[PDB]
């Protein structure tokens, strides 16, 4: 399984690092590249930056 899929933010979070971005429950985050230490790099809410993978989740049917 490789990244680049459509993830959805399940846990809210705010930017606390250079590049990091905010998150909200129900926000469709678009992954672009893997981060560092369980982190991720993508776009969300019209903002491109880094964010914790624990805040995002894969689509569930």
PDB file of N, CA and C in Angstrom:
ATOM      1  N   UNK A   1       0.827  -1.202   0.000  1.00  0.00           N
ATOM      2  CA  UNK A   1       0.000   0.000   0.000  1.00  0.00           C
ATOM      3  C   UNK A   1       0.864   1.256   0.000  1.00  0.00           C
ATOM      4  N   UNK A   2       0.596   2.154  -0.943  1.00  0.00           N
ATOM      5  CA  UNK A   2       1.349   3.397  -1.050  1.00  0.00           C
ATOM      6  C   UNK A   2       0.462   4.604  -0.765  1.00  0.00           C
ATOM      7  N   UNK A   3       1.089   5.715  -0.348  1.00  0.00           N
ATOM      8  CA  UNK A   3       0.375   6.956  -0.035  1.00  0.00           C
ATOM      9  C   UNK A   3      -0.196   7.628  -1.279  1.00  0.00           C
ATOM     10  N   UNK A   4      -0.702   8.846  -1.110  1.00  0.00           N
ATOM     11  CA  UNK A   4      -1.271   9.574  -2.228  1.00  0.00           C
ATOM     12  C   UNK A   4      -2.766   9.360  -2.360  1.00  0.00           C
ATOM     13  N   UNK A   5      -3.354   8.682  -1.380  1.00  0.00           N
ATOM     14  CA  UNK A   5      -4.785   8.408  -1.391  1.00  0.00           C
ATOM     15  C   UNK A   5      -5.564   9.558  -0.760  1.00  0.00           C
ATOM     16  N   UNK A   6      -6.874   9.382  -0.636  1.00  0.00           N
ATOM     17  CA  UNK A   6      -7.732  10.405  -0.049  1.00  0.00           C
ATOM     18  C   UNK A   6      -8.012  10.103   1.421  1.00  0.00           C
ATOM     19  N   UNK A   7      -7.351  10.843   2.305  1.00  0.00           N
ATOM     20  CA  UNK A   7      -7.529  10.657   3.741  1.00  0.00           C
ATOM     21  C   UNK A   7      -8.484  11.702   4.311  1.00  0.00           C
ATOM     22  N   UNK A   8      -9.092  11.382   5.449  1.00  0.00           N
ATOM     23  CA  UNK A   8     -10.027  12.292   6.099  1.00  0.00           C
ATOM     24  C   UNK A   8      -9.630  12.546   7.549  1.00  0.00           C
ATOM     25  N   UNK A   9      -9.565  13.819   7.924  1.00  0.00           N
ATOM     26  CA  UNK A   9      -9.199  14.197   9.284  1.00  0.00           C
ATOM     27  C   UNK A   9     -10.285  13.795  10.276  1.00  0.00           C
ATOM     28  N   UNK A  10      -9.899  13.026  11.289  1.00  0.00           N
ATOM     29  CA  UNK A  10     -10.840  12.573  12.305  1.00  0.00           C
ATOM     30  C   UNK A  10     -10.589  13.272  13.638  1.00  0.00           C
ATOM     31  N   UNK A  11      -9.404  13.857  13.779  1.00  0.00           N
ATOM     32  CA  UNK A  11      -9.039  14.561  15.001  1.00  0.00           C
ATOM     33  C   UNK A  11      -8.530  15.965  14.689  1.00  0.00           C
ATOM     34  N   UNK A  12      -9.079  16.964  15.394  1.00  0.00           N
ATOM     35  CA  UNK A  12      -8.695  18.367  15.211  1.00  0.00           C
ATOM     36  C   UNK A  12      -7.285  18.652  15.718  1.00  0.00           C
ATOM     37  N   UNK A  13      -6.596  19.570  15.050  1.00  0.00           N
ATOM     38  CA  UNK A  13      -5.237  19.934  15.432  1.00  0.00           C
ATOM     39  C   UNK A  13      -4.848  21.285  14.842  1.00  0.00           C
ATOM     40  N   UNK A  14      -3.914  21.965  15.501  1.00  0.00           N
ATOM     41  CA  UNK A  14      -3.454  23.271  15.042  1.00  0.00           C
ATOM     42  C   UNK A  14      -1.966  23.237  14.713  1.00  0.00           C
ATOM     43  N   UNK A  15      -1.521  24.189  13.880  1.00  0.00           N
ATOM     44  CA  UNK A  15      -0.117  24.290  13.467  1.00  0.00           C
ATOM     45  C   UNK A  15       0.790  24.731  14.611  1.00  0.00           C
ATOM     46  N   UNK A  16       1.840  23.955  14.860  1.00  0.00           N
ATOM     47  CA  UNK A  16       2.786  24.267  15.926  1.00  0.00           C
ATOM     48  C   UNK A  16       4.223  24.141  15.434  1.00  0.00           C
ATOM     49  N   UNK A  17       4.380  23.921  14.132  1.00  0.00           N
ATOM     50  CA  UNK A  17       5.703  23.781  13.535  1.00  0.00           C
ATOM     51  C   UNK A  17       5.742  24.392  12.138  1.00  0.00           C
ATOM     52  N   UNK A  18       6.925  24.834  11.725  1.00  0.00           N
ATOM     53  CA  UNK A  18       7.098  25.437  10.409  1.00  0.00           C
ATOM     54  C   UNK A  18       6.659  24.477   9.308  1.00  0.00           C
ATOM     55  N   UNK A  19       5.557  24.808   8.644  1.00  0.00           N
ATOM     56  CA  UNK A  19       5.049  23.965   7.579  1.00  0.00           C
ATOM     57  C   UNK A  19       3.771  23.246   7.966  1.00  0.00           C
ATOM     58  N   UNK A  20       3.673  22.861   9.235  1.00  0.00           N
ATOM     59  CA  UNK A  20       2.494  22.158   9.728  1.00  0.00           C
ATOM     60  C   UNK A  20       1.219  22.912   9.364  1.00  0.00           C
ATOM     61  N   UNK A  21       0.096  22.203   9.373  1.00  0.00           N
ATOM     62  CA  UNK A  21      -1.191  22.804   9.044  1.00  0.00           C
ATOM     63  C   UNK A  21      -2.282  22.319   9.992  1.00  0.00           C
ATOM     64  N   UNK A  22      -3.371  23.097  10.086  1.00  0.00           N
ATOM     65  CA  UNK A  22      -4.507  22.767  10.953  1.00  0.00           C
ATOM     66  C   UNK A  22      -5.292  21.561  10.447  1.00  0.00           C
ATOM     67  N   UNK A  23      -6.191  21.053  11.282  1.00  0.00           N
ATOM     68  CA  UNK A  23      -7.005  19.899  10.918  1.00  0.00           C
ATOM     69  C   UNK A  23      -8.379  19.972  11.581  1.00  0.00           C
ATOM     70  N   UNK A  24      -9.371  19.359  10.943  1.00  0.00           N
ATOM     71  CA  UNK A  24     -10.730  19.353  11.471  1.00  0.00           C
ATOM     72  C   UNK A  24     -11.427  18.032  11.161  1.00  0.00           C
ATOM     73  N   UNK A  25     -12.344  17.632  12.036  1.00  0.00           N
ATOM     74  CA  UNK A  25     -13.081  16.387  11.855  1.00  0.00           C
ATOM     75  C   UNK A  25     -14.026  16.483  10.659  1.00  0.00           C
ATOM     76  N   UNK A  26     -13.721  15.725   9.610  1.00  0.00           N
ATOM     77  CA  UNK A  26     -14.550  15.739   8.420  1.00  0.00           C
ATOM     78  C   UNK A  26     -13.875  16.425   7.250  1.00  0.00           C
ATOM     79  N   UNK A  27     -12.624  16.829   7.445  1.00  0.00           N
ATOM     80  CA  UNK A  27     -11.866  17.502   6.396  1.00  0.00           C
ATOM     81  C   UNK A  27     -11.148  16.490   5.509  1.00  0.00           C
ATOM     82  N   UNK A  28     -11.317  16.636   4.199  1.00  0.00           N
ATOM     83  CA  UNK A  28     -10.687  15.732   3.243  1.00  0.00           C
ATOM     84  C   UNK A  28      -9.250  16.159   2.958  1.00  0.00           C
ATOM     85  N   UNK A  29      -8.301  15.480   3.593  1.00  0.00           N
ATOM     86  CA  UNK A  29      -6.887  15.787   3.408  1.00  0.00           C
ATOM     87  C   UNK A  29      -6.297  14.983   2.254  1.00  0.00           C
ATOM     88  N   UNK A  30      -5.584  15.669   1.367  1.00  0.00           N
ATOM     89  CA  UNK A  30      -4.965  15.020   0.218  1.00  0.00           C
ATOM     90  C   UNK A  30      -3.471  14.816   0.449  1.00  0.00           C
ATOM     91  N   UNK A  31      -3.083  13.577   0.734  1.00  0.00           N
ATOM     92  CA  UNK A  31      -1.683  13.249   0.974  1.00  0.00           C
ATOM     93  C   UNK A  31      -0.858  13.399  -0.299  1.00  0.00           C
ATOM     94  N   UNK A  32       0.382  13.851  -0.144  1.00  0.00           N
ATOM     95  CA  UNK A  32       1.274  14.041  -1.282  1.00  0.00           C
ATOM     96  C   UNK A  32       2.600  13.320  -1.057  1.00  0.00           C
ATOM     97  N   UNK A  33       3.131  13.431   0.156  1.00  0.00           N
ATOM     98  CA  UNK A  33       4.395  12.790   0.500  1.00  0.00           C
ATOM     99  C   UNK A  33       4.440  12.436   1.983  1.00  0.00           C
ATOM    100  N   UNK A  34       5.145  11.357   2.305  1.00  0.00           N
ATOM    101  CA  UNK A  34       5.267  10.911   3.687  1.00  0.00           C
ATOM    102  C   UNK A  34       6.062  11.911   4.520  1.00  0.00           C
ATOM    103  N   UNK A  35       5.696  12.040   5.791  1.00  0.00           N
ATOM    104  CA  UNK A  35       6.387  12.962   6.673  1.00  0.00           C
ATOM    105  C   UNK A  35       7.509  12.297   7.444  1.00  0.00           C
ATOM    106  N   UNK A  36       7.726  12.746   8.676  1.00  0.00           N
ATOM    107  CA  UNK A  36       8.777  12.188   9.518  1.00  0.00           C
ATOM    108  C   UNK A  36       8.263  11.924  10.930  1.00  0.00           C
ATOM    109  N   UNK A  37       8.357  10.669  11.362  1.00  0.00           N
ATOM    110  CA  UNK A  37       7.896  10.307  12.690  1.00  0.00           C
ATOM    111  C   UNK A  37       6.384  10.260  12.786  1.00  0.00           C
ATOM    112  N   UNK A  38       5.763   9.444  11.942  1.00  0.00           N
ATOM    113  CA  UNK A  38       4.316   9.328  11.952  1.00  0.00           C
ATOM    114  C   UNK A  38       3.632  10.561  11.396  1.00  0.00           C
ATOM    115  N   UNK A  39       4.398  11.404  10.713  1.00  0.00           N
ATOM    116  CA  UNK A  39       3.861  12.628  10.130  1.00  0.00           C
ATOM    117  C   UNK A  39       3.472  12.409   8.670  1.00  0.00           C
ATOM    118  N   UNK A  40       2.877  13.430   8.065  1.00  0.00           N
ATOM    119  CA  UNK A  40       2.455  13.350   6.670  1.00  0.00           C
ATOM    120  C   UNK A  40       2.493  14.725   6.010  1.00  0.00           C
ATOM    121  N   UNK A  41       2.574  14.737   4.683  1.00  0.00           N
ATOM    122  CA  UNK A  41       2.620  15.987   3.934  1.00  0.00           C
ATOM    123  C   UNK A  41       1.544  16.010   2.851  1.00  0.00           C
ATOM    124  N   UNK A  42       0.597  16.934   2.986  1.00  0.00           N
ATOM    125  CA  UNK A  42      -0.475  17.044   2.012  1.00  0.00           C
ATOM    126  C   UNK A  42      -1.215  18.364   2.115  1.00  0.00           C
ATOM    127  N   UNK A  43      -2.452  18.385   1.628  1.00  0.00           N
ATOM    128  CA  UNK A  43      -3.265  19.595   1.661  1.00  0.00           C
ATOM    129  C   UNK A  43      -4.566  19.354   2.421  1.00  0.00           C
ATOM    130  N   UNK A  44      -5.086  20.409   3.039  1.00  0.00           N
ATOM    131  CA  UNK A  44      -6.327  20.314   3.798  1.00  0.00           C
ATOM    132  C   UNK A  44      -6.912  21.697   4.070  1.00  0.00           C
ATOM    133  N   UNK A  45      -8.194  21.861   3.769  1.00  0.00           N
ATOM    134  CA  UNK A  45      -8.872  23.135   3.979  1.00  0.00           C
ATOM    135  C   UNK A  45      -8.260  24.227   3.107  1.00  0.00           C
ATOM    136  N   UNK A  46      -7.645  23.819   2.000  1.00  0.00           N
ATOM    137  CA  UNK A  46      -7.027  24.773   1.099  1.00  0.00           C
ATOM    138  C   UNK A  46      -5.640  25.185   1.552  1.00  0.00           C
ATOM    139  N   UNK A  47      -5.046  24.385   2.432  1.00  0.00           N
ATOM    140  CA  UNK A  47      -3.711  24.672   2.945  1.00  0.00           C
ATOM    141  C   UNK A  47      -2.799  23.458   2.799  1.00  0.00           C
ATOM    142  N   UNK A  48      -1.631  23.669   2.202  1.00  0.00           N
ATOM    143  CA  UNK A  48      -0.670  22.592   1.999  1.00  0.00           C
ATOM    144  C   UNK A  48       0.453  22.657   3.029  1.00  0.00           C
ATOM    145  N   UNK A  49       0.663  21.553   3.739  1.00  0.00           N
ATOM    146  CA  UNK A  49       1.708  21.504   4.744  1.00  0.00           C
ATOM    147  C   UNK A  49       1.839  20.135   5.381  1.00  0.00           C
ATOM    148  N   UNK A  50       2.434  20.090   6.566  1.00  0.00           N
ATOM    149  CA  UNK A  50       2.620  18.832   7.279  1.00  0.00           C
ATOM    150  C   UNK A  50       1.530  18.631   8.325  1.00  0.00           C
ATOM    151  N   UNK A  51       1.352  17.387   8.759  1.00  0.00           N
ATOM    152  CA  UNK A  51       0.341  17.062   9.757  1.00  0.00           C
ATOM    153  C   UNK A  51       0.502  15.626  10.248  1.00  0.00           C
ATOM    154  N   UNK A  52       0.047  15.369  11.482  1.00  0.00           N
ATOM    155  CA  UNK A  52       0.130  14.041  12.097  1.00  0.00           C
ATOM    156  C   UNK A  52      -0.809  13.037  11.435  1.00  0.00           C
ATOM    157  N   UNK A  53      -0.277  11.863  11.108  1.00  0.00           N
ATOM    158  CA  UNK A  53      -1.068  10.817  10.472  1.00  0.00           C
ATOM    159  C   UNK A  53      -2.175  10.327  11.399  1.00  0.00           C
ATOM    160  N   UNK A  54      -1.933  10.420  12.704  1.00  0.00           N
ATOM    161  CA  UNK A  54      -2.911   9.985  13.694  1.00  0.00           C
ATOM    162  C   UNK A  54      -4.171  10.843  13.630  1.00  0.00           C
ATOM    163  N   UNK A  55      -4.071  11.977  12.947  1.00  0.00           N
ATOM    164  CA  UNK A  55      -5.203  12.888  12.811  1.00  0.00           C
ATOM    165  C   UNK A  55      -6.025  12.554  11.570  1.00  0.00           C
ATOM    166  N   UNK A  56      -5.444  11.754  10.681  1.00  0.00           N
ATOM    167  CA  UNK A  56      -6.122  11.357   9.453  1.00  0.00           C
ATOM    168  C   UNK A  56      -6.464   9.871   9.467  1.00  0.00           C
ATOM    169  N   UNK A  57      -7.492   9.499   8.713  1.00  0.00           N
ATOM    170  CA  UNK A  57      -7.921   8.108   8.639  1.00  0.00           C
ATOM    171  C   UNK A  57      -8.375   7.751   7.227  1.00  0.00           C
ATOM    172  N   UNK A  58      -8.191   6.488   6.853  1.00  0.00           N
ATOM    173  CA  UNK A  58      -8.582   6.020   5.529  1.00  0.00           C
ATOM    174  C   UNK A  58     -10.095   5.851   5.435  1.00  0.00           C
ATOM    175  N   UNK A  59     -10.640   6.110   4.250  1.00  0.00           N
ATOM    176  CA  UNK A  59     -12.076   5.986   4.026  1.00  0.00           C
ATOM    177  C   UNK A  59     -12.589   4.627   4.487  1.00  0.00           C
ATOM    178  N   UNK A  60     -13.779   4.618   5.078  1.00  0.00           N
ATOM    179  CA  UNK A  60     -14.382   3.383   5.565  1.00  0.00           C
ATOM    180  C   UNK A  60     -15.795   3.214   5.017  1.00  0.00           C
ATOM    181  N   UNK A  61     -16.081   2.031   4.483  1.00  0.00           N
ATOM    182  CA  UNK A  61     -17.396   1.743   3.921  1.00  0.00           C
ATOM    183  C   UNK A  61     -18.238   0.932   4.900  1.00  0.00           C
TER     184      UNK A  61
END
